[PDB]
Design a protein around this nucleic acid. Sequence first.
RNA 1: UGACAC
Length: 156
Amino acid sequence: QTSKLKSVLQDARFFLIKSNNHENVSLAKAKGVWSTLPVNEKKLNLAFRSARSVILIFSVRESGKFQGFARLSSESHHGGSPIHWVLPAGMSAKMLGGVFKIDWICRRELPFTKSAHLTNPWNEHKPVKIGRDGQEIELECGTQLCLLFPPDESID
RNA sequence: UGACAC
């Protein structure tokens, strides 16, 4: 069975998160928080109240593989210092700082070959690895991704 | 409005 995690997959909204470097994803799991473009933080903040739960799926541009997924624990923060994100070329911190708490359901990576049979109809019907940051994935599509993640038992 | 698949 999928343990208590299944409780989210029955009604949660899934979101495709991208990153320009593996360092932002690695830093986000080391901090237990995340940040993204202000148009995406808005979609995640509004999805938080309208859904039973929100799930953020992590990915890197050059990797094409998923680095993990985590449940949005809270809305974006403000009035305090931001996280030390690794800003890629042409990026600036002014688009960030809306840092939100997240709960890592799995720290492990997952190659797209396991999810190759999946596609997002809430998009151009393209595979789950394509599409921009903040793209909303279908309820049952993103659910299936959570079922095909490997166990994090490699950590200990 | 600024982290698509390569």
